Amino acid sequence: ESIRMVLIGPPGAGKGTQAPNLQERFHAAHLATGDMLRSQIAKGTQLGLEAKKIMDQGGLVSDDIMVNMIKDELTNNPACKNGFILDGFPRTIPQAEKLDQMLKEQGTPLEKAIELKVDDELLVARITGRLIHPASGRSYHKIFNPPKEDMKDDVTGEALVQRSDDNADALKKRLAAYHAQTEPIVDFYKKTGIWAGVDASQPPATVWADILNKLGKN
Numbered sequence: 141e142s143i144r145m146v147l148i149g150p151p152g153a154g155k156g157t158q159a160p161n162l163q164e165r166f167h168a169a170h171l172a173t174g175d176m177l178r179s180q181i182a183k184g185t186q187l188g189l190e191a192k193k194i195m196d197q198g199g200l201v202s203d204d205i206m207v208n209m210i211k212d213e214l215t216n217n218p219a220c221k222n223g224f225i226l227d228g229f230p231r232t233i234p235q236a237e238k239l240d241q242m243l244k245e246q247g248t249p250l251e252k253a254i255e256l257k258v259d260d261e262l263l264v265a266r267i268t269g270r271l272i273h274p275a276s277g278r279s280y281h282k283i284f285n286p287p288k289e290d291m292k293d294d295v296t297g298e299a300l301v302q303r304s305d306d307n308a309d310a311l312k313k314r315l316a317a318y319h320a321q322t323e324p325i326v327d328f329y330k331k332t333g334i335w336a337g338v339d340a341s342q343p344p345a346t347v348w349a350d351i352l353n354k355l356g357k358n
């Protein structure tokens with residue numbers, strides 16, 4: 141129950157769905173930069189308000205902002221001493237290089253980078269059917285993964301919402317940004333030898349068993 145890892149995948153691939161599994165199993169901290177940004181928006185902070193406009197256009201928030209955010213969480217979040225699951229970070233080559241240097245100075249290098257590979261065609265249905273519980277970050281899908289109490293988060297009973305960047309127009313922008321900016325990082329980790337690919341087109345429990353097999357832990 142110590143892992144230091146990155147989850148990489150296109151929008152809707154399943155990072156947020158699998159992260160709880162990894163978190164349970166390894167008692168690692170789940171560091172999800174999308175959720176962090178959405179917290180900023182919810183607190184109504186100036187960073188949150190300017191990030192929202194970029195997020196809804198399917199753009200990427202500045203590397204400087206994102207690196208600083210993660211630097212602080214690694215440094216002064218106690219939970220990141222067990223290990224951590226990075227979800228949505230790094231998202232660009234500069235973020236990947238700077239993370240590399242941060243973890244070198246701390247002497248705690250990444251063990252695995254798991255790519256959740258899934259064709260883009262499948263991603264539209266996942267995005268447009270998604271409901272989230274804003275408070276926990278938990279995602280459901282109207283077709284593929286329903287709440288038992290529909291439109292209600294099961295674990296709190298609290299209402300589910302749609303994400304404001306979860307539409308086909310923004311998603312086209314999101315997918316392009318992923319192929320242009322994020323997908324090069326997979327090669328970076330291939331060169332460092334910590335990459336493993338997973339078939340994220342399978343259903344959740346099957347992807348999870350695939351991830352466990354690929355972490356060398358099952």
Ligand SMILES: Nc1ncnc2c1ncn2[C@@H]1O[C@H](COP(=O)(O)OP(=O)(O)OP(=O)(O)OP(=O)(O)OP(=O)(O)OC[C@H]2O[C@@H](n3cnc4c(N)ncnc43)[C@H](O)[C@@H]2O)[C@@H](O)[C@H]1O
Pocket residue numbers: 149150151152153154155156157158173174175177194195198199200201202203206227228229230231232235266267269270271279280281282284285314340341342343344347
């Ligand atoms: N480091 C950074 N640098 C720059 N900018 C940054 C940044 N970090 C964040 N940002 C910014 O913030 C924005 C949002 O970031 P973020 O929120 O991190 O978005 P993302 O990377 O686009 O990912 P998603 O959350 O959409 O996908 P997911 O894979 O986690 O999906 P889920 O598991 O819910 O699953 C999707 C849906 O399908 C479902 N599902 C999951 N798995 C399966 C399966 N196997 N089969 C069927 N249904 C499934 C779910 O139930 C759900 O309905 C960015 O676009 C950018 O603006």
Ligand SMILES: [Mg+2]
Pocket residue numbers: 155156174
């Ligand atoms: Mg997510």
